[PDB]
């Protein structure tokens, strides 16, 4: 089960010059401080989300500020991710900025929703504060990256509730009294994010801390051949094997999904099944006790039939977008709604705005335009509604269909209710900039192949790392070579 595994967030923190100055013009003080923040946030996540946060790297600039900082946290987020993309080569699951400057915002920080494992979307920005306060800020930023949202129809309606009356909850507004705990609805939102295929990169357990090793901390570090969570909790798994952070002769592995009673499980045994059409199931290698690094299908593969195309292991469709924005009770409208509404060029449907004007949709762009759903509530699940709701009644041969939509705002330039980029408008077609384009225009990468015009020679699935996972009876990087017996 994807929920029961204990996941790992590889984290890189970047301290700007103002933070470096804020402690003693000092590298050791900034390092220890940031490490403490990550320590407290990790204490929150360990208990609450069943996820550990490990910092594999840190970079602080003593020389000068690299880019132009803004009082707006969103602008600072965009520019910081520009710096990570154009400069930082370090491998990590997320990269977050610790800024000594004070933003003017309602929010103490900003992070891209569901942007984990992404290069461009993969991190956030957190302003300066005290140790615990900045720990909370990092907690909610990483919460955004991991798929957790503060607001919802369940929460606005009172179905979802923070049960601490004295102190808030992490996703809520932070006062002087700092929240120690997530609402259960945030937990279930995380589980929903994982069950949709997102956050595959989080299943790798770092074997190297940047800090000197310690025994009994829950991680295997240089000088120790085994470790468990605590010597007290070691009795559940690893007790028969690990002693004083060292294995006796008969124990191959301490603990893990591939470890049963101090012995490697055979290669090919399946530790984790695929959670959706975009996910590839993984098998134990017979080398390591931990299940192999999580892999999913390469971008461009079809999911939910021809109705979607995989991105980051997650299936992007229009119906899933309606259910995501407006809640689970919502269903996607029939194509007649979009087809009728794109031609009129009214407020009720359109392909976009240039300046204060509606563009008439092209005939093939019908499905790339204003997003239409049928049963819509009064309030959006996330963000806030701009303008009012849109309801258009369409009658075909006596059938009445109510086509409803709305403009939902997260960031000024990002508007829900427009078809998301990468959503297919048809066979071998996808929506970009509210226009229907062929797949070849996206310049997708590919794996190695022997037979031309095929992916992994048709015998395998191409991963997001551009490595072939072969089907039965096939071996090799191109999956060309056959097996001894059919």
């Amino acid at each position: 089960n994807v929920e029961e595994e204990t996941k790992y967030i590889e984290l890189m923190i970047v301290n700007d010059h103002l933070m470096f100055k804020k402690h003693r013009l000092s590298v050791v003080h900034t390092n220890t401080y940031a490490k403490s923040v990550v320590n407290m946030a990790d204490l929150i996540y360990k208990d609450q989300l069943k996820t550990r946060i490990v910092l594999v790297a840190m970079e602080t600039w003593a020389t000068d500020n690299k880019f132009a900082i803004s009082e707006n946290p969103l602008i600072t987020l965009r520019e910081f991710m520009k710096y990570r993309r154009d400069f930082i080569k370090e491998k990590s699951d997320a990269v977050h900025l610790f800024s000594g400057s004070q933003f003017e915002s309602s929010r103490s920080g900003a992070a891209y929703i569901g942007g984990i494992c992404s290069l461009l979307k993969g991190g956030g920005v957190n302003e300066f504060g005290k140790t615990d306060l900045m720990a909370v800020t990092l907690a909610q930023s990483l919460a955004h990256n991991i798929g957790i949202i503060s607001d919802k129809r369940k929460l606005a309606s009172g179905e979802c509730k923070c049960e601490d009356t004295w102190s808030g909850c992490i996703m809520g507004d932070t006062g002087y009294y700092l929240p120690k705990k997530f609402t259960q609805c945030n937990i279930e939102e995380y589980h929903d994010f994982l069950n949709s295929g997102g956050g595959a990169c989080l299943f790798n357990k770092p074997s190297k801390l940047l800090d000197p090793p310690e025994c009994g901390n829950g991680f295997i570090e240089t000088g120790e051949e085994c470790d468990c969570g605590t010597p007290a909790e070691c009795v559940l798994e690893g007790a028969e094997c690990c002693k004083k952070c060292t294995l006796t002769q008969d124990s191959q592995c301490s603990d893990g999904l591939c470890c049963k009673k101090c012995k490697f499980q055979p290669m090919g045994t399946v530790c984790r099944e695929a959670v959706n059409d975009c996910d590839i199931r993984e098998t134990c290698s017979g080398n390591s006790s931990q299940c192999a690094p999580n892999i999913h299908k390469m971008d461009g593969y079809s999911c939910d039939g021809v109705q979607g195309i995989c991105f980051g292991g997650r299936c992007k469709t229009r119906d899933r977008q309606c259910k995501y924005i407006w809640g689970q009770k919502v269903t996607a409208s029939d194509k007649y709604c979009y087809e009728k509404l794109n031609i009129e060029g009214t407020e009720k449907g359109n392909c976009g705005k240039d300046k204060d004007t509606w563009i008439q949709c092209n005939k093939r762009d019908v499905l790339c335009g204003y997003l239409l759903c049928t049963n819509i509530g009064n309030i959006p699940r996330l963000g806030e509604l701009d303008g009012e709701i849109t309801s258009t009644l369409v009658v075909q041969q006596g059938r009445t269909l109510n086509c409803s939509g709305g403009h939902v705002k997260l960031e000024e330039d990002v508007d829900l209710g427009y078809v998301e980029d990468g959503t297919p408008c048809g066979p071998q077609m996808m929506c970009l900039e509210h226009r229907c384009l062929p797949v070849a225009s996206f310049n997708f990468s590919t794996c190695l192949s022997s037979k031309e015009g095929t992916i992994c020679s048709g015998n395998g699935v191409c991963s997001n790392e551009l490595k072939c996972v072969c089907n039965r009876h096939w071996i090799g990087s191109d999956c060309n070579t056959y097996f001894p017996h059919n």
């Binding site: 309602s106 004295w166 932070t174 006062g175």
Partner: protein, 517 residues
């Protein structure tokens, strides 16, 4: 007719090594003496049946105590010499009963003390000799200084042998200076079952009431002085979940109460003239005010205002003017800051001789900031931060004579008091505190204290020294977690309330003691 233990001529008797005082003397005996007798103590009401003695002397004896009225029955006694003995303490009324005593010598017995007004009741005294005693000089010897100055009788000089600070100093040469016999203390009158956060008091119809905010169960507690055989009793409650600060306000003989909470915290009440029931009037918008950590009440120029501290960055500080019907928004301060505390203080800003109202609010990561009131625009214009201190949780204020000083609170660091000059605040005293959520100045009957609490170690109370012009360590109070200190004045009664966040709150009684009596 003379005892065998004594050597007695016709008019004289000399007794050595006597176990007990004989009550039978010859009629013609005038003077009587006791040398090295085996007496334990003087007999109580002794020396009766022998009125004829004009003289009594004791030398080289051992006496633990000399009982009251020991010399009664000696109307003709004139000279009395008790000297060259070892005596610890004698009773005050011992010498009472002789109005005929002229010469009295206590000298050389090494008395370290005398009781107040030991010499009262003899108006006939002429010579008295205290010499040759080691006298520890304190309030008893203060009354002795009074008597030395006020007596017509000639008294040879005596000296302080203690405390070592005063040695070989004339007891005749001492003045009221460098004697404080008037000391103050705080002893807890009452313990309360509930944990507390904020406390404030108000006066209605000569009855005094106190408002306590209990954060966890969300109870805003109103208690009154019971006045029959009870220190304190709580006559009412107001139930609000996550209650933080309860500040009462009375405008034109009408009681209003503001409560603040985390959710739907903004509220304002009123108490109905009949049935003594509080009724909610207004609810301020939840959107603008979120997670207030403080409330302060101030009135400026015939207008009541109201102020709240917003600890969240989303909400802004808000001052509320009051028209006839209710409170409504006036001004907003410190956008996008986390505000821990707010304080209102009226100070003299030069060149002006008038007192200008000011506001001091403290942030989490930011230095405190001061606002100057502007009468023309009905706003606060000047915005200035007090330099060279950071992480100030709260700032309070007090005034000693014409000067105005402030106490700035720091959780871990140096909490310091500063003097207000013409322009800015000037450093006075740096007092380290560990885990202090409050620094409270308090003025009780021309005594300015300061209370600095600790969630870790003992709460350190300080007292003001007028000559030193600097707070001095005074008393230690034990509180599990103190978030406040409040001064409560009943009629001719003074109490202080100490909240406890992690434990039961304390009620201390203020007692003034005089050691000179």
């Amino acid at each position: 007719k003379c005892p065998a233990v004594c050597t007695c001529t016709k008019d004289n008797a000399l007794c050595e090594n006597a176990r007990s005082i004989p009550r039978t003397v010859p009629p013609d005996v005038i003077s009587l003496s006791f040398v090295r007798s085996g007496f334990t103590e003087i007999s109580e009401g002794s020396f009766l049946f022998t009125p004829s003695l004009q003289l009594l002397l004791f030398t080289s004896n051992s006496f633990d105590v000399i009982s009251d009225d020991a010399f009664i029955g000696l109307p003709h006694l004139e000279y009395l010499f008790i000297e060259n003995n070892n005596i610890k303490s004698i009773s005050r009324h011992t010498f009472r009963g002789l109005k005929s005593l002229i010469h009295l010598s206590l000298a050389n017995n090494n008395l370290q003390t005398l009781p107040k007004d030991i010499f009262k009741g003899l108006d006939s005294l002429t010579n008295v000799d205290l010499r040759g005693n080691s006298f520890n000089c304190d309030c008893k010897l203060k009354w002795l200084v009074e008597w030395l100055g006020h007596t017509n009788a000639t008294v040879e000089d005596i000296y302080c042998e203690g405390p070592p600070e005063y040695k070989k100093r004339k007891i005749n040469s001492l003045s009221s200076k460098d004697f404080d016999c008037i000391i103050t203390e705080f002893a807890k009158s009452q313990d309360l079952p509930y944990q507390s956060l904020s406390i404030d008091t108000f006066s209605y119809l000569n009855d005094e009431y106190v408002v306590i905010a209990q954060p966890f169960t969300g109870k805003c507690i109103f208690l009154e002085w019971d006045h029959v055989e009870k220190t304190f009793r709580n006559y009412d409650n107001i139930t609000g979940t996550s209650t933080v600060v309860c500040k009462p306000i009375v405008i034109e003989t009408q009681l209003y109460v503001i409560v603040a909470q985390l959710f739907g915290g903004s509220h304002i009440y009123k108490r109905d003239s009949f049935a003594n029931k509080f009724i909610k009037i207004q609810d301020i918008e939840i959107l603008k005010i979120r997670k207030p950590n403080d409330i302060e009440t101030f009135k400026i120029e015939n207008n009541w205002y109201f102020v709240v501290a917003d600890s969240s960055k989303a909400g802004f500080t808000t001052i509320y003017k009051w028209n006839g019907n209710g409170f409504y928004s006036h001004q907003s301060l410190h956008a996008w800051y986390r505000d821990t505390d707010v304080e209102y203080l009226e100070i003299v800003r030069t060149p002006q001789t008038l007192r200008t109202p000011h506001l001091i609010l403290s942030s989490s990561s930011q230095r405190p900031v001061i606002y100057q009131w502007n009468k023309a625009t009905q706003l606060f214009t000047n915005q200035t931060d007090i330099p060279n201190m950071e992480d100030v949780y709260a700032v309070k204020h007090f005034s000693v004579k014409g000067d105005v000083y402030i106490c700035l609170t720091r959780f871990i660091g140096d909490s310091k008091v500063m003097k207000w000059g013409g322009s800015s605040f000037q450093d006075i005293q740096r007092m380290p505190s560990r885990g202090s959520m409050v620094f409270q100045p308090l003025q009780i009957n021309n005594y300015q204290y300061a209370i600095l609490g600790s969630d870790y170690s003992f709460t350190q109370v300080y007292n003001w020294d007028a000559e030193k012009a600097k707070f001095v360590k005074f008393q230690e109070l034990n509180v599990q977690a103190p978030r406040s200190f409040t001064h409560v004045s009943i009629n001719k009664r003074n109490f202080l309330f100490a909240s406890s966040f992690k434990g039961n709150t304390q009620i201390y009684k203020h007692v003034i003691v005089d050691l000179s009596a």
